[PDB]
Paper text:
CD73 (ecto-5′-nucleotidase, NT5E) is a glycosylated 125-kDa homodimeric membrane-bound enzyme which dephosphorylates AMP in the extracellular milieu to adenosine. In the physiological form two monomers associate through extensive noncovalent contacts between the C-terminal domains forming a dimer. The active site in each monomer of CD73 is comprised of substrate contact residues in both the N- and C-terminal domains in addition to zinc cofactors bound by the N-terminal domain. Following binding of the AMP substrate to the C-terminal domain, the N-terminal domain and zinc cofactors align with the AMP in a “closed” CD73 conformation in which catalysis takes place to generate the adenosine product.
In the crystal asymmetric unit, one TB19 is bound to one CD73 monomer and only the Fv of the Fab could be built because of weak electron densities in the CH1/CL domains. A biological assembly of dimeric CD73 complex was obtained through a 2-fold crystallographic symmetry operation. Two zinc ions and one phosphate were built accordingly and coordinated by residues Asp-36, His-38, Asp-85, Asn-117, His-118, His-220 and His-243 in the catalytic center as the TB19 complex was crystallized in the presence of phosphate. The conserved dimerization interface and position of the zincs and phosphate indicate the structure of the CD73 dimer in the complex with TB19 is biologically relevant. However, when bound by TB19, CD73 takes on a conformation in which the N- and C-terminal domains are in an intermediate position between those previously reported for the open and closed conformers. All of the TB19 CDR loops except CDRL2 contact a portion of the N-terminal domain adjacent to the zinc and phosphate binding site, although none of the antibody residues directly interact with any of the catalytic center forming residues. Because of the orientation of TB19 and its epitope location, clashes between C-terminal domain and TB19 are observed when superimposing the N-terminal domains of CD73 in our structure and the closed conformer of CD73. Thus, bound TB19 will block the alignment of N- and C-terminal domains in CD73 and prevent formation of the closed conformer. As a result, TB19 binding will separate the zinc ions and catalytic residues of the N-terminal domain from the phosphoanhydride bond of the substrate, thereby blocking enzymatic activity. The “locking” of CD73 by antibody binding to this intermediate partly open inactive conformer presumably reflects the primary mechanism of action of this antibody.
Author numbering:
A (entry chain L): 1 to 108
B (entry chain H): 2 to 119
C (entry chain A): 27 to 549
The structure:
Amino acid sequence: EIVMTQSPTTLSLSPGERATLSCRASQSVNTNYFSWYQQKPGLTPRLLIYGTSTRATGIPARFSGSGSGTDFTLTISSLQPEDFGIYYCQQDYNLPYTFGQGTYLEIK
Amino acid sequence: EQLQESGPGLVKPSETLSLTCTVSGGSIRNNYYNWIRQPAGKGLEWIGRIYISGTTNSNPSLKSRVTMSIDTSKNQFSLKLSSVTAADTAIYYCAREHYVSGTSLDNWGQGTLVTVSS
Amino acid sequence: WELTILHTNDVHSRLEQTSEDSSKCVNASRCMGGVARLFTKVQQIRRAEPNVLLLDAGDQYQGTIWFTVYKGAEVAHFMNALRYDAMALGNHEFDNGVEGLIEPLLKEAKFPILSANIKAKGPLASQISGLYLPYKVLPVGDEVVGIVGYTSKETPFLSNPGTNLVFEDEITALQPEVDKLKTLNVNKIIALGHSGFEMDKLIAQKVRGVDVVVGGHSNTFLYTGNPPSKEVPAGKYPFIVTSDDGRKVPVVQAYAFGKYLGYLKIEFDERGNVISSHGNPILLNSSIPEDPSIKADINKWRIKLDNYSTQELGKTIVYLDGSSQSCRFRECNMGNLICDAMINNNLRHADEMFWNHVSMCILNGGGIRSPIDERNNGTITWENLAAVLPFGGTFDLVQLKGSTLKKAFEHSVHRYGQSTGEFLQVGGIHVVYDLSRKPGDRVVKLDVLCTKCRVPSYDPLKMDEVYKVILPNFLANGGDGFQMIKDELLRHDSGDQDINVVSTYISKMKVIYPAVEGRIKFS
Ligand SMILES: *[C@@H]1O[C@H](CO)[C@@H](O[C@@H]2O[C@H](CO)[C@@H](O[C@H]3O[C@H](CO[C@H]4O[C@H](CO)[C@@H](O)[C@H](O)[C@@H]4O)[C@@H](O)[C@H](O[C@H]4O[C@H](CO)[C@@H](O)[C@H](O)[C@@H]4O)[C@@H]3O)[C@H](O)[C@H]2NC(C)=O)[C@H](O)[C@H]1NC(C)=O
Ligand SMILES: [Zn+2]
Ligand SMILES: [Zn+2]
């Protein structure tokens, strides 16, 4: 199975700063099968980005999905309070589908 | 466009499990329908997919324990998980692919917390 | 009405002639397969018989520098030059994704490509429409033959087809496509496919109207006679199945790596019934000349690959002894180097739980297929390395009880002295054998590198304790007789390709000098 190592495990930055989250895949992932989830500790995870780079309906332009081969990046440019909780990268290129360990983002 | 899962909140060790995801926004389209779970605190784990036609793949970690089903005269998709254990207590989500890309997981359900304990 | 089916399967990018062990060709007179030689034998049969089909049953993608550099452009060019009549999709055809199947293969291949059990959906349905087929009506002389293809249900695990393909049950998907050919008044039908010999047999038994099954995936050698090389047949060629409707259905495969040309001659009656079948895989050895046009073309494509294959990855200042007389009998520095590479690759720390998830590595001596000489100014190339590891196994992570590893080490020496491949090279393990004891009782010392410690040190193996080991996929699946591993393990997690792991290690270390240092001793 394709292992998804996201770093860092925990970021603490101020609102208006830029959160750049990094996900590294043990195997190359075709950019059509790489996606980003937000989750608030408790409730349904919400799709942010499908393809490596395409925003889903209702998601603002702050979120820039990037990368290819092994090395994928989720940039959030001007952070706001409601951007709290956990962020996961996801691949569905190979079975099983696999999610990253998650990146924990607190606003300072 | 919405997916609610039916199925109870309590399980014995060494026992069964009927979970039934109901779509009623529109209908089951030409798309893969997924089950996912999460151990409480930790990270997301993919269970399996089923296409409309009935075809199913599941996680090799769980392979022997998963059965899944689909029905278009009913308009939902079932899951069964045999022989349950401490490390199986976790929130159980149904989900479907983004309908433009036929990729990702887009329109998740509430979830249901299941527990192993006597 | 008589048909000659020529068939290849699992050629695995072996475009050039190989050794007898399907690696790089050293002595010209002892070399085999390659498209230039295959072209010679195929032309000759086409000049002798009127009704000839050349079929491939998948796994052209993946296996050598050819596939890595040309990404299946080479498959389309050299299969087109050989005028293949039809190909079934294999699992490895999806290794660069459905995207990497379409872009060179489906767009440049002049021959039909078949899979009755792969369904496309999403925006891929329009993009791939018509580029592979459920079935094909082939005119052959003044008759027609139907082909129906099929691909392993397991491809979504074994490869990277992505979300927009459905790999359905072969039997269920095949039957309506055979029924369709029967309504188009096609009375002669071949199932060409890539699910293995066990599935080939079930198709022959269960799909009404299949006359013949041509197969792949399991690398199955079928031969009627005294075998001409080292491959031991699983049975006679062809393998006859009695179908549930009472028909005799020939089932055939042709091993792998382009070493054999399958050759099946069928007599049909007027109504398409198989009256008789006979043949044998043709060993493609040095006694068939390479066609000089195809060879000159191969040489042309070779020029751009010679850059890539003689690329210095690192240096050794020692003879890397991966010779069988060393690696099947004693500790060898090639074994030590590969296991040290395996452990270096699998690095995950946890503060109070372990220095590393894994401290321990085993590898069968048989898997190490060549030495490397250090005198070429110390250079290690991809080619040099390809020769040690020609077969694209992965290095996997397993959990085993001490007692299971004890049994593996007993098997390692149960018939010591006879140059068998099961003899284990190790990392993070010190073992002592007493060969004057009875088999099952020759392991007199087994010490393992702890993980639940801050300072890595050696402790005696415990029978009722659980350990993490990196070993080849081959050992994980019980190859070279290690059933105790396959039957007794508690977790299996699939890792990275053997050659990639060894390659990055050499490039990170820049200069290696592995020694024989007493990981394995004898009383
Ligand atoms: C590519 O593959 C081809 C197909 O395998 C190879 O052709 C084959 O070569 C082998 C090896 O030379 C041949 O094997 C046998 O035949 C020879 C020739 O011999 C004669 O004596 C026989 C007595 O029974 C007669 O029946 C023959 O007509 C002939 O006069 C034998 O000498 C060999 O046998 C001896 O060794 C065997 C061991 O198996 C003993 O059992 C016997 O006691 C005997 O002394 C072989 O039996 C084979 O005939 C030939 N195959 C075909 C189909 O023609 C080709 O060699 C290879 N090319 C390269 C470059 O390697
Ligand atoms: Zn193969
Ligand atoms: Zn295969």
